Design a protein around this ligand. Structure first.
Ligand SMILES: CNCc1ccc(-c2cc3cc(F)cc(C(N)=O)c3o2)cc1
Ligand SMILES: CNCc1ccc(-c2cc3cc(F)cc(C(N)=O)c3o2)cc1
Ligand SMILES: CNCc1ccc(-c2cc3cc(F)cc(C(N)=O)c3o2)cc1
Lengths: 147, 147, 147
Protein backbone atom coordinates (compact mmCIF):
# COMPACT_ATOMS: atom_id res chain seq x y z
CA UNK A 1 0.00 0.00 0.00
CA UNK A 2 0.87 3.67 0.20
CA UNK A 3 1.04 3.30 3.99
CA UNK A 4 3.82 0.70 3.72
CA UNK A 5 6.00 2.91 1.52
CA UNK A 6 5.59 5.83 3.94
CA UNK A 7 6.48 3.70 6.95
CA UNK A 8 9.52 2.37 5.10
CA UNK A 9 10.70 5.89 4.40
CA UNK A 10 10.05 6.85 8.03
CA UNK A 11 12.11 3.87 9.19
CA UNK A 12 14.99 4.93 6.95
CA UNK A 13 14.77 8.53 8.17
CA UNK A 14 14.81 7.59 11.86
CA UNK A 15 17.71 5.17 11.27
CA UNK A 16 19.72 7.93 9.60
CA UNK A 17 18.71 10.39 12.30
CA UNK A 18 19.93 8.05 14.99
CA UNK A 19 23.38 7.92 13.39
CA UNK A 20 23.43 11.71 13.06
CA UNK A 21 22.44 12.07 16.72
CA UNK A 22 25.39 9.86 17.66
CA UNK A 23 27.67 12.11 15.60
CA UNK A 24 26.18 15.18 17.30
CA UNK A 25 26.81 13.62 20.70
CA UNK A 26 30.43 12.85 19.81
CA UNK A 27 31.10 16.35 18.53
CA UNK A 28 29.45 17.88 21.60
CA UNK A 29 31.55 15.78 23.97
CA UNK A 30 34.66 16.78 22.02
CA UNK A 31 33.69 20.45 22.31
CA UNK A 32 33.21 19.99 26.06
CA UNK A 33 36.66 18.44 26.33
CA UNK A 34 38.31 21.21 24.31
CA UNK A 35 36.49 23.84 26.41
CA UNK A 36 37.72 22.24 29.64
CA UNK A 37 41.26 21.93 28.22
CA UNK A 38 41.35 25.54 27.01
CA UNK A 39 41.98 24.59 23.37
CA UNK A 40 40.02 27.38 21.66
CA UNK A 41 40.76 26.38 18.08
CA UNK A 42 39.76 22.77 18.74
CA UNK A 43 36.60 24.06 20.44
CA UNK A 44 35.73 26.21 17.43
CA UNK A 45 36.10 23.25 15.05
CA UNK A 46 34.02 20.96 17.20
CA UNK A 47 31.27 23.55 17.65
CA UNK A 48 31.15 23.89 13.87
CA UNK A 49 30.89 20.10 13.57
CA UNK A 50 28.17 19.90 16.18
CA UNK A 51 26.25 22.63 14.38
CA UNK A 52 26.48 20.70 11.14
CA UNK A 53 25.04 17.55 12.71
CA UNK A 54 22.44 19.63 14.56
CA UNK A 55 21.28 21.09 11.24
CA UNK A 56 20.98 17.57 9.83
CA UNK A 57 18.96 16.41 12.86
CA UNK A 58 16.70 19.43 12.30
CA UNK A 59 16.13 18.34 8.70
CA UNK A 60 15.37 14.73 9.68
CA UNK A 61 12.82 16.13 12.17
CA UNK A 62 11.18 18.19 9.41
CA UNK A 63 11.06 15.12 7.16
CA UNK A 64 9.52 13.03 9.94
CA UNK A 65 6.74 15.55 10.55
CA UNK A 66 5.98 15.64 6.82
CA UNK A 67 5.94 11.86 6.49
CA UNK A 68 3.71 11.28 9.51
CA UNK A 69 1.17 13.80 8.21
CA UNK A 70 1.23 11.88 4.92
CA UNK A 71 0.68 8.61 6.78
CA UNK A 72 -2.31 10.04 8.64
CA UNK A 73 -4.04 10.73 5.32
CA UNK A 74 -3.57 7.28 3.80
CA UNK A 75 -3.70 5.18 7.01
CA UNK A 76 -5.66 6.92 9.77
CA UNK A 77 -4.76 5.65 13.23
CA UNK A 78 -4.62 7.29 16.66
CA UNK A 79 -1.07 5.94 16.90
CA UNK A 80 0.05 7.90 13.83
CA UNK A 81 -1.74 10.95 15.25
CA UNK A 82 0.31 10.32 18.39
CA UNK A 83 3.59 10.03 16.49
CA UNK A 84 2.94 13.31 14.68
CA UNK A 85 2.39 15.24 17.90
CA UNK A 86 5.64 13.79 19.34
CA UNK A 87 7.49 14.56 16.11
CA UNK A 88 6.25 18.17 16.19
CA UNK A 89 7.41 18.61 19.78
CA UNK A 90 10.75 17.10 18.77
CA UNK A 91 11.00 19.56 15.87
CA UNK A 92 10.37 22.49 18.21
CA UNK A 93 12.97 21.16 20.65
CA UNK A 94 15.75 20.54 18.13
CA UNK A 95 15.19 24.01 16.71
CA UNK A 96 15.59 25.41 20.24
CA UNK A 97 18.80 23.40 20.57
CA UNK A 98 20.03 24.89 17.30
CA UNK A 99 19.34 28.43 18.52
CA UNK A 100 21.26 27.81 21.74
CA UNK A 101 24.13 26.20 19.83
CA UNK A 102 24.21 29.27 17.59
CA UNK A 103 24.43 31.47 20.69
CA UNK A 104 27.33 29.31 21.91
CA UNK A 105 29.07 29.59 18.52
CA UNK A 106 28.76 33.38 18.60
CA UNK A 107 29.91 33.58 22.20
CA UNK A 108 32.97 31.44 21.44
CA UNK A 109 33.67 33.64 18.42
CA UNK A 110 33.34 36.75 20.58
CA UNK A 111 35.37 35.10 23.31
CA UNK A 112 32.59 35.66 25.85
CA UNK A 113 32.89 32.76 28.28
CA UNK A 114 29.91 33.82 30.38
CA UNK A 115 27.42 33.78 27.51
CA UNK A 116 29.11 30.64 26.19
CA UNK A 117 28.72 28.63 29.38
CA UNK A 118 25.01 29.41 29.74
CA UNK A 119 24.28 28.65 26.09
CA UNK A 120 26.31 25.44 26.03
CA UNK A 121 24.64 24.16 29.18
CA UNK A 122 21.20 24.95 27.73
CA UNK A 123 22.18 23.14 24.55
CA UNK A 124 23.03 19.98 26.47
CA UNK A 125 19.75 20.12 28.42
CA UNK A 126 17.74 20.57 25.20
CA UNK A 127 19.61 17.66 23.65
CA UNK A 128 18.43 15.49 26.54
CA UNK A 129 14.87 16.74 26.17
CA UNK A 130 15.02 15.89 22.48
CA UNK A 131 16.55 12.48 23.04
CA UNK A 132 13.61 11.69 25.33
CA UNK A 133 11.23 12.76 22.58
CA UNK A 134 13.18 10.79 19.99
CA UNK A 135 12.87 7.59 22.04
CA UNK A 136 9.11 8.02 22.43
CA UNK A 137 8.92 8.49 18.67
CA UNK A 138 10.91 5.32 18.01
CA UNK A 139 8.59 3.28 20.23
CA UNK A 140 5.49 4.79 18.63
CA UNK A 141 7.00 3.90 15.25
CA UNK A 142 7.61 0.34 16.46
CA UNK A 143 4.00 0.14 17.66
CA UNK A 144 3.07 1.40 14.17
CA UNK A 145 5.25 -1.06 12.26
CA UNK A 146 3.50 -3.93 14.09
CA UNK A 147 -0.01 -2.68 13.29
CA UNK B 1 58.06 29.02 -8.98
CA UNK B 2 56.86 25.41 -8.98
CA UNK B 3 58.10 25.24 -5.38
CA UNK B 4 55.79 28.04 -4.20
CA UNK B 5 52.74 26.29 -5.65
CA UNK B 6 53.74 22.92 -4.19
CA UNK B 7 54.38 24.21 -0.67
CA UNK B 8 51.06 26.03 -0.91
CA UNK B 9 49.17 22.85 -1.89
CA UNK B 10 50.96 21.07 0.98
CA UNK B 11 49.85 23.63 3.53
CA UNK B 12 46.25 23.18 2.30
CA UNK B 13 46.48 19.38 2.55
CA UNK B 14 47.89 19.53 6.08
CA UNK B 15 45.21 22.00 7.20
CA UNK B 16 42.53 19.67 5.84
CA UNK B 17 44.25 16.67 7.43
CA UNK B 18 44.30 18.42 10.80
CA UNK B 19 40.51 18.93 10.65
CA UNK B 20 40.06 15.25 9.78
CA UNK B 21 42.33 14.22 12.65
CA UNK B 22 40.16 16.23 15.05
CA UNK B 23 37.11 14.34 13.73
CA UNK B 24 38.96 11.01 14.07
CA UNK B 25 39.83 11.88 17.66
CA UNK B 26 36.23 12.70 18.53
CA UNK B 27 34.94 9.51 16.98
CA UNK B 28 37.61 7.42 18.70
CA UNK B 29 36.76 8.95 22.08
CA UNK B 30 33.07 8.25 21.46
CA UNK B 31 33.85 4.63 20.54
CA UNK B 32 35.83 4.26 23.77
CA UNK B 33 32.80 5.57 25.70
CA UNK B 34 30.37 3.24 23.95
CA UNK B 35 32.74 0.34 24.55
CA UNK B 36 32.97 1.14 28.26
CA UNK B 37 29.16 1.44 28.46
CA UNK B 38 28.52 -1.83 26.60
CA UNK B 39 26.47 -0.07 23.93
CA UNK B 40 27.34 -2.34 21.03
CA UNK B 41 25.25 -0.68 18.33
CA UNK B 42 26.59 2.76 19.26
CA UNK B 43 30.13 1.37 19.22
CA UNK B 44 29.57 -0.02 15.71
CA UNK B 45 28.47 3.42 14.46
CA UNK B 46 31.43 5.19 15.99
CA UNK B 47 33.90 2.61 14.73
CA UNK B 48 32.54 3.05 11.22
CA UNK B 49 32.92 6.81 11.57
CA UNK B 50 36.47 6.43 12.81
CA UNK B 51 37.30 4.12 9.91
CA UNK B 52 35.94 6.65 7.43
CA UNK B 53 38.01 9.48 8.93
CA UNK B 54 41.05 7.24 9.10
CA UNK B 55 40.68 6.43 5.40
CA UNK B 56 40.65 10.19 4.72
CA UNK B 57 43.79 10.71 6.83
CA UNK B 58 45.43 7.91 4.86
CA UNK B 59 44.54 9.72 1.62
CA UNK B 60 45.94 13.03 2.82
CA UNK B 61 49.11 11.29 4.02
CA UNK B 62 49.52 9.81 0.53
CA UNK B 63 48.99 13.20 -1.08
CA UNK B 64 51.54 14.73 1.30
CA UNK B 65 54.21 12.21 0.28
CA UNK B 66 53.41 12.80 -3.40
CA UNK B 67 53.66 16.59 -3.04
CA UNK B 68 56.95 16.41 -1.15
CA UNK B 69 58.33 13.99 -3.77
CA UNK B 70 57.40 16.59 -6.41
CA UNK B 71 58.99 19.39 -4.37
CA UNK B 72 62.20 17.39 -4.13
CA UNK B 73 62.26 17.02 -7.93
CA UNK B 74 62.33 20.81 -8.24
CA UNK B 75 65.38 20.94 -5.93
CA UNK B 76 69.03 20.40 -7.08
CA UNK B 77 70.02 19.57 -3.43
CA UNK B 78 68.87 17.38 -0.53
CA UNK B 79 66.84 20.32 1.01
CA UNK B 80 63.35 18.72 0.95
CA UNK B 81 64.91 15.31 1.59
CA UNK B 82 64.21 15.46 5.32
CA UNK B 83 60.61 16.65 4.94
CA UNK B 84 59.93 13.79 2.51
CA UNK B 85 61.51 11.27 4.91
CA UNK B 86 59.27 12.50 7.75
CA UNK B 87 56.21 12.38 5.51
CA UNK B 88 57.02 8.82 4.43
CA UNK B 89 57.33 7.74 8.08
CA UNK B 90 54.05 9.55 8.81
CA UNK B 91 52.37 7.65 5.99
CA UNK B 92 53.76 4.32 7.24
CA UNK B 93 52.46 5.02 10.72
CA UNK B 94 49.05 6.23 9.48
CA UNK B 95 48.68 3.08 7.41
CA UNK B 96 49.59 0.92 10.40
CA UNK B 97 46.92 2.76 12.38
CA UNK B 98 44.49 2.09 9.55
CA UNK B 99 45.24 -1.66 9.47
CA UNK B 100 44.98 -1.90 13.23
CA UNK B 101 41.68 -0.02 13.33
CA UNK B 102 40.40 -2.42 10.61
CA UNK B 103 41.34 -5.35 12.86
CA UNK B 104 39.43 -3.71 15.71
CA UNK B 105 36.33 -3.07 13.58
CA UNK B 106 36.29 -6.69 12.42
CA UNK B 107 36.82 -8.01 15.93
CA UNK B 108 33.91 -5.93 17.23
CA UNK B 109 31.66 -7.20 14.43
CA UNK B 110 32.80 -10.76 15.20
CA UNK B 111 32.19 -10.27 18.94
CA UNK B 112 35.84 -11.06 19.76
CA UNK B 113 36.61 -8.65 22.59
CA UNK B 114 40.18 -9.88 23.28
CA UNK B 115 41.22 -9.07 19.70
CA UNK B 116 39.22 -5.85 19.71
CA UNK B 117 40.83 -4.35 22.80
CA UNK B 118 44.34 -5.25 21.69
CA UNK B 119 43.88 -3.70 18.26
CA UNK B 120 41.93 -0.68 19.48
CA UNK B 121 44.64 0.12 22.02
CA UNK B 122 47.35 -0.35 19.39
CA UNK B 123 45.45 2.04 17.09
CA UNK B 124 45.36 4.68 19.79
CA UNK B 125 49.12 4.36 20.33
CA UNK B 126 49.82 4.59 16.61
CA UNK B 127 47.71 7.73 16.42
CA UNK B 128 49.88 9.39 19.05
CA UNK B 129 53.00 8.32 17.14
CA UNK B 130 51.48 9.72 13.95
CA UNK B 131 50.66 12.99 15.70
CA UNK B 132 54.31 13.43 16.69
CA UNK B 133 55.33 13.01 13.06
CA UNK B 134 52.57 15.31 11.81
CA UNK B 135 53.76 18.14 14.07
CA UNK B 136 57.36 17.47 13.13
CA UNK B 137 56.43 17.73 9.49
CA UNK B 138 54.60 21.03 10.00
CA UNK B 139 57.69 22.51 11.65
CA UNK B 140 59.93 21.35 8.82
CA UNK B 141 57.60 22.90 6.26
CA UNK B 142 57.62 26.25 8.07
CA UNK B 143 61.39 26.25 7.67
CA UNK B 144 60.89 25.76 3.92
CA UNK B 145 58.02 28.25 3.42
CA UNK B 146 60.13 31.28 4.38
CA UNK B 147 61.60 31.88 0.90
CA UNK C 1 9.46 -9.68 11.45
CA UNK C 2 12.95 -8.55 12.41
CA UNK C 3 14.26 -11.43 10.29
CA UNK C 4 12.71 -10.12 7.09
CA UNK C 5 14.00 -6.60 7.73
CA UNK C 6 17.51 -7.94 8.30
CA UNK C 7 17.42 -10.09 5.17
CA UNK C 8 16.19 -7.20 3.04
CA UNK C 9 18.91 -4.86 4.34
CA UNK C 10 21.44 -7.61 3.65
CA UNK C 11 20.25 -7.99 0.07
CA UNK C 12 20.58 -4.22 -0.39
CA UNK C 13 24.06 -4.10 1.14
CA UNK C 14 25.29 -6.93 -1.10
CA UNK C 15 23.80 -5.29 -4.20
CA UNK C 16 25.57 -2.04 -3.35
CA UNK C 17 28.78 -3.92 -2.58
CA UNK C 18 28.63 -5.66 -5.94
CA UNK C 19 28.57 -2.30 -7.74
CA UNK C 20 31.45 -1.01 -5.62
CA UNK C 21 33.41 -4.16 -6.42
CA UNK C 22 32.86 -3.52 -10.13
CA UNK C 23 34.10 0.04 -9.67
CA UNK C 24 37.13 -1.26 -7.77
CA UNK C 25 37.90 -3.75 -10.53
CA UNK C 26 37.78 -1.07 -13.19
CA UNK C 27 40.00 1.28 -11.20
CA UNK C 28 42.48 -1.57 -10.59
CA UNK C 29 42.63 -2.40 -14.30
CA UNK C 30 43.12 1.29 -15.13
CA UNK C 31 45.95 1.51 -12.56
CA UNK C 32 47.65 -1.52 -14.06
CA UNK C 33 47.48 0.07 -17.53
CA UNK C 34 48.87 3.36 -16.23
CA UNK C 35 51.68 1.51 -14.48
CA UNK C 36 52.64 -0.40 -17.62
CA UNK C 37 52.53 2.82 -19.67
CA UNK C 38 54.64 4.67 -17.09
CA UNK C 39 52.04 7.41 -16.53
CA UNK C 40 52.67 8.11 -12.85
CA UNK C 41 50.11 10.89 -12.43
CA UNK C 42 47.38 8.75 -13.98
CA UNK C 43 48.46 5.87 -11.77
CA UNK C 44 48.16 8.07 -8.67
CA UNK C 45 44.61 9.04 -9.63
CA UNK C 46 43.52 5.47 -10.21
CA UNK C 47 45.17 4.19 -7.05
CA UNK C 48 43.34 6.85 -5.06
CA UNK C 49 40.07 5.76 -6.64
CA UNK C 50 40.86 2.13 -5.87
CA UNK C 51 41.65 2.98 -2.26
CA UNK C 52 38.33 4.81 -1.91
CA UNK C 53 36.34 1.94 -3.38
CA UNK C 54 38.25 -0.55 -1.27
CA UNK C 55 37.39 1.40 1.88
CA UNK C 56 33.74 1.21 0.82
CA UNK C 57 33.95 -2.56 0.25
CA UNK C 58 35.54 -2.87 3.70
CA UNK C 59 32.56 -1.04 5.21
CA UNK C 60 29.98 -3.13 3.36
CA UNK C 61 31.77 -6.32 4.45
CA UNK C 62 31.58 -5.16 8.08
CA UNK C 63 27.89 -4.32 7.67
CA UNK C 64 27.28 -7.78 6.18
CA UNK C 65 28.87 -9.50 9.18
CA UNK C 66 26.87 -7.37 11.60
CA UNK C 67 23.59 -8.14 9.81
CA UNK C 68 24.25 -11.88 9.65
CA UNK C 69 25.35 -11.84 13.30
CA UNK C 70 22.00 -10.25 14.10
CA UNK C 71 20.16 -12.86 12.05
CA UNK C 72 21.92 -15.70 13.86
CA UNK C 73 20.85 -14.24 17.19
CA UNK C 74 17.20 -14.27 16.16
CA UNK C 75 17.37 -17.76 14.54
CA UNK C 76 20.25 -19.80 15.96
CA UNK C 77 20.51 -22.54 13.32
CA UNK C 78 23.23 -23.98 11.08
CA UNK C 79 22.24 -22.04 7.95
CA UNK C 80 22.57 -18.77 9.86
CA UNK C 81 25.83 -20.04 11.34
CA UNK C 82 27.05 -21.01 7.87
CA UNK C 83 26.22 -17.65 6.32
CA UNK C 84 27.91 -15.77 9.17
CA UNK C 85 31.06 -17.90 8.97
CA UNK C 86 31.35 -17.17 5.23
CA UNK C 87 30.77 -13.45 5.80
CA UNK C 88 33.46 -13.36 8.48
CA UNK C 89 35.94 -15.05 6.13
CA UNK C 90 34.96 -12.60 3.39
CA UNK C 91 35.61 -9.73 5.77
CA UNK C 92 39.00 -11.13 6.75
CA UNK C 93 39.95 -11.44 3.08
CA UNK C 94 38.71 -7.98 2.17
CA UNK C 95 40.73 -6.45 5.02
CA UNK C 96 43.80 -8.35 3.85
CA UNK C 97 43.26 -6.90 0.36
CA UNK C 98 42.82 -3.47 1.90
CA UNK C 99 46.11 -3.60 3.82
CA UNK C 100 47.88 -4.86 0.70
CA UNK C 101 46.49 -2.07 -1.42
CA UNK C 102 47.70 0.36 1.24
CA UNK C 103 51.21 -1.03 0.83
CA UNK C 104 50.96 -0.62 -2.92
CA UNK C 105 49.64 2.95 -2.73
CA UNK C 106 52.42 3.98 -0.36
CA UNK C 107 55.07 2.32 -2.50
CA UNK C 108 53.83 4.16 -5.59
CA UNK C 109 53.90 7.45 -3.69
CA UNK C 110 57.41 6.67 -2.34
CA UNK C 111 58.65 5.72 -5.81
CA UNK C 112 59.36 2.09 -4.84
CA UNK C 113 58.10 0.00 -7.76
CA UNK C 114 59.55 -3.29 -6.54
CA UNK C 115 57.28 -3.06 -3.50
CA UNK C 116 54.41 -1.61 -5.54
CA UNK C 117 54.31 -4.37 -8.15
CA UNK C 118 54.55 -7.19 -5.61
CA UNK C 119 51.85 -5.68 -3.43
CA UNK C 120 49.62 -4.82 -6.37
CA UNK C 121 49.72 -8.41 -7.61
CA UNK C 122 49.05 -9.66 -4.09
CA UNK C 123 46.06 -7.30 -3.91
CA UNK C 124 44.59 -8.67 -7.13
CA UNK C 125 44.93 -12.25 -5.84
CA UNK C 126 43.22 -11.37 -2.58
CA UNK C 127 40.45 -9.64 -4.50
CA UNK C 128 39.77 -12.79 -6.47
CA UNK C 129 39.78 -14.80 -3.24
CA UNK C 130 37.23 -12.38 -1.82
CA UNK C 131 35.07 -12.70 -4.92
CA UNK C 132 34.91 -16.48 -4.39
CA UNK C 133 33.61 -15.94 -0.85
CA UNK C 134 31.23 -13.22 -2.03
CA UNK C 135 29.59 -15.55 -4.53
CA UNK C 136 29.49 -18.34 -1.93
CA UNK C 137 27.72 -15.99 0.45
CA UNK C 138 25.15 -15.05 -2.20
CA UNK C 139 24.41 -18.75 -2.73
CA UNK C 140 23.98 -19.26 1.01
CA UNK C 141 21.58 -16.31 1.25
CA UNK C 142 19.32 -17.90 -1.37
CA UNK C 143 18.89 -20.86 1.00
CA UNK C 144 18.12 -18.32 3.76
CA UNK C 145 15.79 -16.03 1.76
CA UNK C 146 13.34 -17.70 -0.67
CA UNK C 147 12.51 -19.83 2.36
C1 LIG D 1 26.30 16.23 26.24
N1 LIG D 1 26.51 14.82 25.97
C2 LIG D 1 26.65 14.63 24.54
C3 LIG D 1 25.28 14.65 23.85
C4 LIG D 1 24.87 15.77 23.12
C5 LIG D 1 23.64 15.75 22.47
C6 LIG D 1 22.81 14.66 22.65
C7 LIG D 1 21.52 14.62 21.89
C8 LIG D 1 20.70 13.51 21.74
C9 LIG D 1 19.65 13.93 20.85
C10 LIG D 1 18.51 13.31 20.32
C11 LIG D 1 17.72 14.07 19.45
F1 LIG D 1 16.60 13.53 18.91
C12 LIG D 1 18.00 15.39 19.13
C13 LIG D 1 19.13 16.00 19.66
C14 LIG D 1 19.41 17.45 19.29
N2 LIG D 1 20.43 18.20 19.93
O1 LIG D 1 18.75 17.97 18.47
C15 LIG D 1 19.96 15.24 20.53
O2 LIG D 1 21.09 15.64 21.17
C16 LIG D 1 23.22 13.54 23.33
C17 LIG D 1 24.46 13.54 23.96
C1 LIG E 1 42.41 8.28 21.71
N1 LIG E 1 42.22 9.72 21.79
C2 LIG E 1 41.53 10.16 20.57
C3 LIG E 1 42.54 10.33 19.42
C4 LIG E 1 42.54 9.44 18.35
C5 LIG E 1 43.44 9.62 17.33
C6 LIG E 1 44.37 10.63 17.38
C7 LIG E 1 45.29 10.82 16.19
C8 LIG E 1 46.10 11.91 15.95
C9 LIG E 1 46.71 11.69 14.67
C10 LIG E 1 47.62 12.42 13.87
C11 LIG E 1 47.97 11.88 12.65
F1 LIG E 1 48.85 12.55 11.86
C12 LIG E 1 47.44 10.68 12.19
C13 LIG E 1 46.56 9.98 12.99
C14 LIG E 1 46.02 8.66 12.48
N2 LIG E 1 45.32 7.78 13.36
O1 LIG E 1 46.21 8.34 11.33
C15 LIG E 1 46.18 10.51 14.24
O2 LIG E 1 45.31 10.00 15.16
C16 LIG E 1 44.33 11.56 18.40
C17 LIG E 1 43.43 11.38 19.44
C1 LIG F 1 40.05 -6.56 -12.46
N1 LIG F 1 41.12 -7.47 -12.12
C2 LIG F 1 41.69 -7.01 -10.87
C3 LIG F 1 40.69 -7.24 -9.73
C4 LIG F 1 39.92 -8.40 -9.70
C5 LIG F 1 39.02 -8.61 -8.66
C6 LIG F 1 38.87 -7.63 -7.69
C7 LIG F 1 37.94 -7.88 -6.53
C8 LIG F 1 36.80 -8.66 -6.50
C9 LIG F 1 36.30 -8.59 -5.15
C10 LIG F 1 35.21 -9.13 -4.44
C11 LIG F 1 35.07 -8.84 -3.10
F1 LIG F 1 34.00 -9.36 -2.43
C12 LIG F 1 35.97 -8.01 -2.43
C13 LIG F 1 37.05 -7.49 -3.12
C14 LIG F 1 38.05 -6.61 -2.39
N2 LIG F 1 39.28 -6.18 -3.02
O1 LIG F 1 37.80 -6.30 -1.26
C15 LIG F 1 37.21 -7.77 -4.50
O2 LIG F 1 38.19 -7.37 -5.34
C16 LIG F 1 39.66 -6.51 -7.69
C17 LIG F 1 40.55 -6.29 -8.73
Amino acid sequence: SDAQEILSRLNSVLEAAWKTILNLASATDAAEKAYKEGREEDLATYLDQAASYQSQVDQYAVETVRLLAELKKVFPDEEADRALQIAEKLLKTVQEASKTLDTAVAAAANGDEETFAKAFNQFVSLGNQADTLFTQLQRTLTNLNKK
